[PDB]
Design a protein around this ligand. Structure first.
Ligand SMILES: CC1=CC(=O)CC(C)(C)[C@@]1(O)/C=C/C(C)=C\C(=O)O
Ligand SMILES: CC1=CC(=O)CC(C)(C)[C@@]1(O)/C=C/C(C)=C\C(=O)O
Lengths: 193, 193
């Protein structure tokens, strides 16, 4: 029947084992899900050579996904938008023609622990039951500093598609956006200001 | 009625004016098209800190688009594939679910001038009449060497879509793949071998 994910029990690509062992409790706490037979889930990681708060300042901007995500034509939150759990955004995504619309809900926002997450709750695309969580972590070794971002999701496998294609699609989207996040924040860190 | 494109008469993003003035004859020769009212066309550029042949070795691999393009699940050319004008490839693209299929024809392959191009001639997506050309150019200044890649396309604007969304879609795809090309070839150049 239902199962618990195992992301917190194996090393995700692009993470070292030493890094994983430092993150294993966070992965258990924030990146575990109970999933049903029609669902899949994945955990992706991205190392970033920038301080945590530099990365978090970008990651946390629910109303400006275009700043670290590809193919965002627009994102609207409506005036009086205040960043609070339950707020929603309408994203127009130009990954194809016509452009897709995704309505997304802010699920988590913890500025102290550097955790956020959202759920897709409308739109005209095929990803159903999509929910993701992103956490940001600082590392240090001999005075050197870096960040690891972890992003996991759960989603329904769409009718007529395999889990492997579903995971390949969502994994590729998340991985490429994490690479943009790394570039944007490493540029920020390099240039200071 | 029909018009000639003007890419060879203005500076595309990410190119310096000095670079453009060196490339203007190539842009006129390889990146100009006669287009009809229902069509749009764009020219994109990418500077790469690697020698021309390092970039060209990758650009020229019609059967391995996955090496510098995002979201390629597979590409099949069939046994006895020989790289000749008229050869075709079946690309499966995982930019959405279900994955798209594009059947593409090799239009140009000039290893001396570093020119290639392809036309989409089948599949189950919406891009109709898509044709692109890619050229690769070497620059030198005071012993320093770099490459510029130019990629242009012509495509039909799909029913119910604006030219601006059509250009935004194709421009973003091409720009992001040119960035992967730059990363892949700059890594190659940095590591030599
Ligand atoms: C890029 C794209 C293409 C689709 O077909 C679905 C949807 C529009 C939701 C999406 O924005 C997917 C976004 C995902 C998976 C994650 C994110 O944004 O963190
Ligand atoms: C990424 C993608 C999404 C689509 O919806 C159309 C198609 C499948 C053709 C495509 O491969 C487009 C590829 C383009 C424009 C250029 C290329 O490859 O040089």
């Amino acid at each position: 029947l239902s199962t618990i994910t195992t992301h917190h029990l194996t090393v995700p690509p692009g993470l070292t084992p030493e890094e994983f062992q430092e993150l294993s409790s966070s992965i258990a706490e924030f990146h575990s899900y109970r999933i049903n037979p029609g669902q899949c889930s994945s955990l992706l990681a991205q190392r970033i050579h920038a301080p945590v708060e530099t990365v978090w300042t970008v990651v946390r901007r629910f109303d400006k996904p275009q700043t670290y995500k590809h193919f965002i034509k627009s994102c609207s939150v409506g005036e009086d938008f205040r960043m609070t759990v339950g707020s929603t955004r309408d994203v127009t995504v130009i990954s194809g023609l016509p452009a897709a619309t995704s309505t997304e809900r802010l699920d988590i926002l913890d500025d102290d622990r550097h955790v956020t997450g959202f759920s897709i709750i409308g739109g005209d695309h095929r990803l159903r039951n999509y929910r993701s969580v992103t956490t940001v972590h600082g590392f240090e070794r001999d005075g050197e500093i870096w960040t690891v971002v972890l992003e996991s999701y759960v989603v329904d496998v769409p009718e007529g598609n395999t889990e492997e294609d579903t995971r390949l699609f969502a994994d590729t989207v998340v991985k490429l956006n994490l690479q943009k996040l790394a570039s944007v924040t490493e540029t920020l860190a390099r240039e200071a200001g």
